[PDB]
């Protein structure tokens, strides 16, 4: 009864003298009301049917930003750290390599987080599916007085499969950078997500590869360098891991 | 003004985004552009609108014929080999040569070869004996893009004849694509032989 208290009070105010009521009463719903709480975070619901009141410290400040900037980087660092410029591969280019020799080959999704040293390795273990756009910088440095060029081609997954049946002369139908080493020492090449499915598996080469072929052999003079390194740096323009999985599990997200 | 780059002095590394080219000028000539037909024959819709022979098959019994369709490497169809992906409707042209019977054509992109057991639910077109029929197949594939190089790029074709006796009947298939969406150019394939 919610009127139970207010009948005792009325009775006591009808019996009151000059010293006021001798009794008082109030009825109300308990301070341990029957309610259900539900909390959700990312991929997580927590249905509690007997919650307690949640507590917080004395006058708390839940802004987590440091006002003195003891780590003076943007707070977005650590969420944008799995997409920084990393060294994907490195090879050597002998002066005896012919005119269609394949120098490097970088398995595109998996080579961004294939090893612990790559800072996107940690995030890549918890997701099975990815969709991402790359930025490559292939760097080849030679001294002045050495000729030869290279072809930096982005071959997508269908081209990897059928590469043996293709003409090398029309290999520049793909997003390429034909780089004369006497001039440039770096070929930039932005590649978007190119696949036949919306997402690829993380641990796969299913966004093709980024090969580096010899366009014309090194024409070195006597008493000059013979080997020339070819480094491939990559950076993800956008990264979008999606399917949660057990740590480093091989989860197939394709239909056979 | 005309710069020396438009007289043909360039660097191949200074080619920016792919497929960006400019014409050069000489004193006495420049690009002409003469149309000698009212429509282009290199427009993508137009060129693949014409059909091309795929396969022929002799039906010596009533059994379903599963034939995986794919882009050809001969004919005029092979210009699709310059692309990696494809999305679109495909027309299938079936010439049923029989004395009696009907041929039940159906198309699926489903790789499971056990969904043709009850063929009716894949959408059957019955072709009378000695007739031919063009059916337009919609893009009912799980993948949003078909890989051109795959052996079952254009899905599978199921033909089950309503045989009269065991008298064989033949069927020639020709494919063509109505409004194809081709993406991402890839290298030209090398002619047969070579190596």
């Amino acid at each position: 009864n919610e009127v139970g208290g207010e009948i005792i009070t009325k009775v006591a105010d009808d019996a009151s003298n000059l010293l006021g009521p001798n009794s008082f009463a109030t009825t109300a719903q308990p301070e341990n009301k029957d309610v259900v709480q539900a909390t959700t975070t990312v991929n997580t619901t927590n249905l509690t049917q007997h919650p307690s009141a949640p507590t917080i410290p004395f006058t708390p400040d839940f802004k987590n930003v440091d006002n003195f900037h003891s780590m003076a980087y943007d707070i977005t660092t650590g969420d944008k750290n799995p997409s920084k410029l990393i060294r994907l591969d490195t090879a050597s280019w002998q002066t005896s390599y012919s005119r269609q020799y394949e120098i490097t080959t970088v398995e595109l999704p998996k080579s961004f987080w294939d090893d612990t040293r790559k800072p996107a390795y940690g995030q890549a273990k918890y997701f099975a599916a990815v969709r991402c756009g790359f930025h490559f910088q292939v760097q080849v440095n030679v001294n002045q007085g050495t000729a030869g060029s290279a072809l930096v081609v982005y071959e997508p997954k269908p081209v990897i499969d059928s590469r043996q049946y293709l003409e090398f002369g029309s290999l520049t139908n793909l997003p390429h950078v034909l780089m004369n080493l006497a001039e440039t020492t770096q070929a930039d090449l932005c590649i978007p997500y190119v696949a036949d499915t919306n997402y690829v598996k993380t641990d796969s080469s299913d966004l093709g590869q980024l090969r580096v072929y010899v366009w014309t052999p090194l024409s070195v003079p006597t008493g000059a360098s013979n080997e020339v390194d070819v480094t491939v740096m990559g950076s993800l323009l956008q990264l979008d891991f999606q399917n949660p999985r057990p740590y480093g599990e091989d989860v197939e997200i394709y239909d056979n | 003004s005309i710069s020396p780059n438009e007289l043909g002095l360039t660097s191949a590394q200074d080619d920016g985004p792919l497929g960006n080219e400019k014409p050069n000028y000489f004193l006495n000539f420049r690009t002409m552009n003469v149309d000698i037909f009212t429509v282009s024959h290199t427009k993508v819709d137009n060129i693949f609108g014409r059909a091309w022979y795929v396969t022929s098959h002799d039906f010596n019994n009533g059994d379903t014929w599963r034939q995986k369709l794919t882009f050809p490497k001969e004919g005029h169809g092979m210009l699709s080999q310059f692309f990696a992906y494809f999305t679109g409707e495909i027309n299938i042209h079936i010439l049923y040569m029989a004395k009696q019977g009907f041929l039940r054509v159906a198309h699926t992109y489903d790789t499971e070869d056990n969904r043709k057991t009850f063929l009716s639910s894949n959408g059957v077109i019955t072709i009378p004996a000695g007739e031919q029929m063009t059916l337009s197949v919609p893009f009912y594939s799980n993948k949003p893009l078909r890989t051109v190089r795959h052996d079952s790029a254009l899905g599978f074709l199921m033909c089950r004849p309503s045989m009269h006796g065991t008298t064989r009947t033949t069927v020639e298939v020709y494919v063509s694509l109505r409004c194809p969406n081709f993406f991402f150019p890839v290298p030209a394939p090398k002619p047969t032989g070579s190596r």
Epitope: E252, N256 | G62, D63, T64, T111, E112, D113, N114, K116, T117, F118, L119, R160
Partner: antibody, heavy 118, light 108 residues
């Protein structure tokens, strides 16, 4: 449920016998049947399967274009017209029945087999 | 395609946990099945759909795995679990195949 094959024997190379498999104890026409063979002391190669209506026949590559699995739902008998036999067709031929509620082929009940010697 | 089993002969005592593995070339999505075949008898279905148990099959048998790595496990051998075990598969192509067999025999 009991399958009983019959028709095994001895034939000369390039022969042509046809195994039968009278079946009882179940509604025959609502299940696919197969003929899986077992060459002496080894494996279990699957020769061919026929769907419940008989409107779909599958053959293994090894015996394809030679054997012809048929069935005659009326008298509950599954056939295996084998033509142009080799010495690789010397096996015990079991007549398996397809499993119940599943969308895949798994062999439920099996016969006792009939030897074929070539 | 062809799937190869891992042991071709296992020898173990009555009460041991034996594991026969079957490994396919390409993924089949739980579409495996295990057979027991006593010598001179026709095969018996044990485990269909990679882990389901056929009726009247002991609970010793327990299949697991999916994709390309299936395994039948007998928790404790009994004297009637000495037989040959084949793994038949189902795939899209309807190219049903069986394993090589794995003879499980007495360890004397």
């Amino acid at each position: 449920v009991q399958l009983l094959e019959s028709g095994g024997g001895l034939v000369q190379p390039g022969g042509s016998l046809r195994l039968s498999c009278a079946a009882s104890g179940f509604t025959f026409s609502s299940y696919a049947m197969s003929w899986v063979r077992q060459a002496p002391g080894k494996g279990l190669e699957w020769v061919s399967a026929i769907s419940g209506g008989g409107d779909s026949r599958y053959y293994a590559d090894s015996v394809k274009g030679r054997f012809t699995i048929s069935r005659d739902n009326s008298k509950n008998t599954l056939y295996l017209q084998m033509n142009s036999l080799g010495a690789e067709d010397t096996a015990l031929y079991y007549c398996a029945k397809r499993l119940g509620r599943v969308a895949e082929y798994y062999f439920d009940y099996w016969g006792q087999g009939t030897l074929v010697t070539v | 395609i062809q799937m190869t089993q891992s042991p071709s002969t296992l020898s173990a005592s009555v009460g041991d946990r034996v594991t026969i593995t079957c490994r396919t070339s390409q993924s089949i999505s739980n579409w495996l099945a295990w057979y027991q075949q006593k010598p001179g008898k026709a095969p018996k279905l044990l485990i269909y759909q990679a882990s389901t148990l056929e009726n009247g099959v002991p609970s010793r048998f327990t299949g697991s795995g999916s994709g390309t790595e299936f395994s039948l496990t007998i928790s404790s051998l009994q004297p009637d679990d000495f037989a040959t075990y084949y793994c038949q598969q189902y795939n899209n192509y309807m190219a049903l195949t069986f394993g090589g067999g794995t003879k499980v025999e007495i360890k004397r």
